[PDB]
Swiss-Prot record, chain A:
Pathway: Cell wall biogenesis; cell wall polysaccharide biosynthesis. It comes from the Bacteria. This is Murein DD-endopeptidase MepS/Murein LD-carboxypeptidase. Belongs to the peptidase C40 family. Monomer.
From Swiss-Prot, chain B:
The gene is prc. Its EC number is 3.4.21.102. This is Tail-specific protease. Belongs to the peptidase S41A family. Residues 611-626 have a biased composition (Basic and acidic residues).
Swiss-Prot record, chain C:
SMART domains: TPR. Homodimer. Interacts with Prc and IbpB. It comes from Escherichia coli (strain K12). It comes from the Bacteria. Processed by Prc protease in the C-terminus. This is Lipoprotein NlpI. InterPro entries: Lipoprotein_NlpI (IPR023605), TPR-like_helical_dom_sf (IPR011990), TPR_rpt (IPR019734), Ycf3 (IPR050498). Keywords: Cell cycle, Cell division, Cell membrane, Lipoprotein, Membrane, Palmitate, Repeat, Signal, TPR repeat. TPR repeats lie at residues 38-71, 72-105, 210-243. May be involved in cell division. May play a role in bacterial septation or regulation of cell wall degradation during cell division. Negatively controls the production of extracellular DNA (eDNA). Disruption phenotype: Highly sensitive to osmotic conditions in low-salt medium and also thermosensitive under low-salt conditions. Shows pronounced filamentation at 42 degrees Celsius under low osmolarity, but not at 30 or 37 degrees. Growth in low-salt medium is severely restricted at 30 degrees and no growth is observed at 37 and 42 degrees Celsius. Shows increased eDNA production. Produces 100-fold more outer-membrane vesicles making the organism more resistant to toxins, and enhancing survival under stress. Higher sensitivity to ultra high pressure than wild-type counterparts.
Length: 142, 651, 264
């Protein structure tokens, strides 16, 4: 009831997705502290949606659309209780209407906020906990 | 061509069949909810079941041969687990040769009156009967069935000269098609005997039947779609696929048909009198194939031309994907007609029952009439629309572990009150659906007590990974469906024997029907596990007096409910002497005229009630659609009064 | 409540580690056919199994099967792992595949019997284990497993059949001493002393202790002494002989006992 318990398919899935957090953190390390800029796709200034697009394209090869609204309809919806790393977390920011980030585990998500640029933030923070919307999964590979 | 008994070929078991049986046997013996063993007793019961399957009506059976082969009625277990189905094939071959011995004299004689109907009787339940000992009695009795059929055809039917010669042709071609059965029939018959002896829902599917189940669970027909029916070596292309891509090439129609055709460049094998399964298998093809299409005069004509037509993924669907949620009438009260719990039923109904969450909801209805259960994951994904993330069904294996299946993706999208209408011939997944809504108290149960199925089956292929590599000459192998788990409601109870007792009883349901799970062989017992955790919305399931007496008023205030109660009284009167029916042409013509006069009287009463002109003769009115269902109208009235309450019961 | 013999728990040998390193090196290279690749994958899975890395072993076996699907030994190991995981139906199917690709792989019968034994199909397990006994009646552990199966049907009959098997054997292999203890013929102290006598090096001592502690745990479990059973199973698994069926199914029995303790 230890290791053998997990089936062979589950084992392959674990080996194939064990580095997802590591890749997102690679992107974060190369990209942490970059300023926030609306409609920006460069290290000179980037927005949440552009950061999500570049991250999912450069770390996984998934070419998501550009706007947060289009990304919000991408992939398949997921519930709060069972959300994995690499899923898209959507907040009702309202500065442009919506906000997109990348969940990394332990109620944490990487995102390019308008206040402090691209950073890690907590789902349990009062601002984000109060202003949570939906969540979408796009890394379909299992 | 056609000759005598020697012409009947000696059937032999096919190469892969052995292995197939073995695997099947293995599964059935090792992994099945019923803890049984393939002992001598079970082998004998398999022998008896296979005998009853060979001829259900106890027509052509022979005590001598039965006892000759009842010597090895203990070895059937070794036969199954060894793959050498020798006894089954030998017994089937002897039955085929004895088919000729069944009778000979009557044929073509279809008009000349040879026998009179002087207060004779005939059994309608011919299952319980001893094995015939002599020969003369059955040789004489066989003609009675076809002679009574032709006498009733003189009572009601078509003209004599047109249909009689075709009926004689049908009988000769029936004798012909009986001598054209393949080994797959015998194999599947034996496997079905075994499975049904185990459990009524356990079954084996031949490769043809495996493709049938796959399409019935995918709708992705691979070939050319067309619903067909045959009459004497010619099938009639009804081709109701209309909007079908192979139907876009409707250059041929119902009368522009041919027999011999090829597939994607194969030699045009002139099929002349082949089996329906054979010609349908020849008509099918993979995704991305071709088909030979011949051009002929649109009607009767002998002038063939050759062209091509394409094959691709074709999805024939008798579904209505229509999404018109409008506030019309008094409330948005709709009826949802479900033909089956398809794997794609959630993927096509989510277009229907999703987009109304923020807007105003209403009392809509879901009708599960004549339903067939397809998938359990789909049943839970469809039942999660009306219940905000909750256990829909509990499953229990032979060990004792209980698991509650619920898709943890999505809240109650349709926040409106709901009425479920269900009949007695409903699917098991439909029972799960209705039981979930009844235990949650969110919907209202209306209709007839269901069939009462409480067993979960597993559908598995019989293919190993090494089959393709080292046995390339083998064909596709069958599949199996064996009961692995038993399902229960969240209230703790089950529907394996007691079914679901609805809050709104219907008149046609009050009769004691001789159908259901009880009259099925080897049906499992009843057991109630402890109740699950679930939030019940008001204890209105046991206390429904508000709409109960209202709808009793409604059923006592209309003559349709009364005429239907008269029909069920006729049923309750006839079912006393239902098993043995008496055939006197005088009293039979009397009852036929009585039924025709009663139908004409009821039609004139409803015409006077509705203001439509009265019918006088049966010739002007063609075959059309009769009244669909007054119980759906009572469900709409129930939904109306439910919206009345919700307007008067927010406090 | 008794003094016990103890061995130095088995440590991975240098040979195993050099072989595993070279196997990694060879599989790293491209110059290898698919048959040779599946062979090396099966061997590396076998080595992982011998080292107790059962998930990695199952991975290498599954890959070797994805290369060559006609490997009965891979199906055998996969069925053993399914038994250990508690998925008994899949184990039955895997062993069926073993016997389908090769019906002379007799040990498969034993394994499937054990599966059925742990599944609850005591009669079918009896059939398979009796077949295995027919293949060689003098092997004491075959008779031991047959008795373990038959005990779920008729205790007296099973003990009598075990005594008959013991009498009919040559009584040459040491394992029969366990059988003797199962027959009330030698004291447990005599069993342990004969064990000490028959062991030459630390590894043979570890093997002896594994097998005997597993069977003694089963014995004390049948008598209702849960604590002695758990302790004997732990002392068995402590020998670090991950290749013995006694080791695997001792872990399994410990898991089942923990399961029984957890649910009240």
């Amino acid at each position: 009831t230890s290791s053998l318990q997990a089936s062979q398919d589950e084992f392959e899935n674990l080996v194939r997705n064990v580095d997802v957090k590591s890749r997102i953190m690679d992107q974060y390390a190369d990209w942490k502290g970059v300023r926030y800029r609306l409609g920006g796709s460069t290290k000179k200034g980037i927005d949440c949606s552009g950061f999500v697009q570049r991250t999912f394209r450069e770390q996984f090869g998934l070419e998501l659309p550009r706007s947060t609204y289009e990304q919000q309809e991408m992939g398949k919806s997921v519930s709060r209780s069972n959300l994995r790393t690499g899923d898209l977390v959507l907040f009702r920011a309202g500065s442009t209407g919506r906000h997109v980030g990348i969940y990394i585990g332990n109620n944490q998500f990487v995102h390019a906020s308008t206040s402090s640029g691209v950073i890690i933030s907590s789902m349990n923070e009062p601002y984000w906990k109060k202003r949570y919307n939906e969540a979408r999964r796009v890394l379909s590979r299992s | 061509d056609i000759t005598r008994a020697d012409q009947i070929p000696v059937l032999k078991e096919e190469t892969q069949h052995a292995t197939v049986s073995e695997r099947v046997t293995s599964r059935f013996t090792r992994s099945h909810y019923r803890q049984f063993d393939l002992d001598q007793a079970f082998s004998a019961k398999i022998f008896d079941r296979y005998l009853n399957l060979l001829d259900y009506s106890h027509n052509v059976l022979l005590a001598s041969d039965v006892e000759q082969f009842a010597k090895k009625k203990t070895e059937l277990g070794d036969e199954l687990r060894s793959g050498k189905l020798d006894v089954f094939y030998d017994l089937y071959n002897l039955a085929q040769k004895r088919r000729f011995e069944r009778y000979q004299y009557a044929l073509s004689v279809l008009e000349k009156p040879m026998d009179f109907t002087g207060n004779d009787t005939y059994n309608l339940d011919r299952s319980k009967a001893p094995w015939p000992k002599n020969e003369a009695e059955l040789n004489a009795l066989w003609d009675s069935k076809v002679k009574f059929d032709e006498l009733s055809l003189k009572l009601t039917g078509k003209t004599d000269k047109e249909i009689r010669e075709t009926l004689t042709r049908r009988y000769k071609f029936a004798i012909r098609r009986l001598a054209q059965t393949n080994s797959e029939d015998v194999f599947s018959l034996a496997m079905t005997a075994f499975a049904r002896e185990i459990d009524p829902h356990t079954n084996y599917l031949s490769p043809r039947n495996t493709e049938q189940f796959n399409t019935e669970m995918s709708l992705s027909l691979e070939g050319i779609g067309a619903v067909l029916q045959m009459d004497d070596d010619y099938t009639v292309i009804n081709s109701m696929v209309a909007g079908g891509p192979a139907a876009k090439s409707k250059a041929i129609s119902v009368g522009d048909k041919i027999v011999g055709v090829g597939q994607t460049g194969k030699p045009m094998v002139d099929v002349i009198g082949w089996r329906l399964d054979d010609v349908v298998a020849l008509i099918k093809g993979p995704k991305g194939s071709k088909v030979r299409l011949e051009i002929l005069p649109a009607g009767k004509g002998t002038k063939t031309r050759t062209v091509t037509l394409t094959r691709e993924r074709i999805r024939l669907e008798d579904r209505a994907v229509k999404m018109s949620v409008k506030t019309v009438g008094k409330e948005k009260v709709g009826v949802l007609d479900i033909p089956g719990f398809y794997v794609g039923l959630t993927d096509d109904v989510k277009v229907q029952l999703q987009k109304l969450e923020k807007q105003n909801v209403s009392s809509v209805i879901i009708d599960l009439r004549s339903n067939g259960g397809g998938a359990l994951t789909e049943a839970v994904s469809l039942s999660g629309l009306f219940i905000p993330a909750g256990p829909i069904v509990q499953v229990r294996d032979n060990n004792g572990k209980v698991r509650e299946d619920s898709d943890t993706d999505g809240q109650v999208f349709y926040k409106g009150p709901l009425v479920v209408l269900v009949d007695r011939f409903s699917a098991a997944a439909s029972e799960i659906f209705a039981a979930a809504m009844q235990d949650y108290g969110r919907a209202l149960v209306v209709g007839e007590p269901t069939f009462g199925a409480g067993t979960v089956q597993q559908y598995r292929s019989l293919n190993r990974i090494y089959d393709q590599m080292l046995r390339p000459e083998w064909p596709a192998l069958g599949s199996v469906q064996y009961t692995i788990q038993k399902f229960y409601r969240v209230n703790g109870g089950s529907t394996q024997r007691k079914g679901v007792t609805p809050d709104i009883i219907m008149p046609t349901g009050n009769e004691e029907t001789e159908t259901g799970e009880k009259f099925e062989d080897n049906a499992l017992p009843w057991d109630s596990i402890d109740a699950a955790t679930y939030v019940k919305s008001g204890d209105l399931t046991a206390f429904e007096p508000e709409l109960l007496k209202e709808h009793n008023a409604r059923i006592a205030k209309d003559p349709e409910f009364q005429n239907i109660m008269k029909d069920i009284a006729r049923f309750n009167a006839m079912k006393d002497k239902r098993n043995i029916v008496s055939l006197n042409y005088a009293v039979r013509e009397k009852e036929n005229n009585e039924d025709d006069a009663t139908r004409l009287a009821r039609l004139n009463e409803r015409f006077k009630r509705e203001g439509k002109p009265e019918l006088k003769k049966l010739d002007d009115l063609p075959k059309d659609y009769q009244e669909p269902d007054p119980y759906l109208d009572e469900t709409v009235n129930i939904a109306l009064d439910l919206a009345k309450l919700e307007k008067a019961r927010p406090a | 409540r008794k003094s016990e013999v103890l061995a130095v728990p088995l440590q991975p040998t240098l040979q195993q580690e050099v072989i595993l390193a070279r196997m990694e090196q060879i599989l790293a290279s491209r110059a290898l056919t698919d048959d040779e690749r599946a062979q090396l994958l099966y061997e590396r899975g076998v080595l992982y199994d011998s080292l107790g890395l059962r998930a990695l072993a199952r991975n290498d076996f599954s890959q070797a099967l994805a290369i060559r699907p006609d490997m009965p030994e891979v199906f055998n190991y996969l069925g053993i792992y399914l038994t250990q995981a508690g998925n008994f139906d899949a184990a039955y199917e895997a062993f069926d595949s073993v016997l389908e690709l090769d019906p002379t792989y007799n040990y498969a019968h034993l394994n499937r019997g054990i599966a059925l034994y742990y599944g609850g199909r005591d009669k079918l397990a009896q059939d398979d284990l009796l077949a295995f006994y027919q293949d060689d009646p003098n092997d004491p552990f075959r008779s031991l497993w047959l008795y373990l199966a038959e005990q779920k049907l008729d205790e007296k009959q099973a003990k009598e059949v075990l005594k008959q098997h013991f009498e009919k054997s040559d009584k040459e292999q040491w394992g029969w001493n366990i059988v003797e203890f199962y027959l009330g013929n030698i004291s447990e102290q005599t069993l342990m002393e004969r064990l000490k006598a028959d062991a030459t090096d630390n590894t043979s001592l570890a093997e002896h202790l594994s097998e005997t502690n597993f069977y003694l745990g089963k014995y004390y479990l049948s008598l209702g002494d849960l604590d002695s059973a758990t302790a004997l199973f732990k002392l068995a698994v402590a020998n670090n002989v991950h290749n013995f069926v006694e080791h695997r199914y001792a872990l399994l029995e410990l898991s089942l006992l923990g399961q029984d303790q957890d649910d009240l």
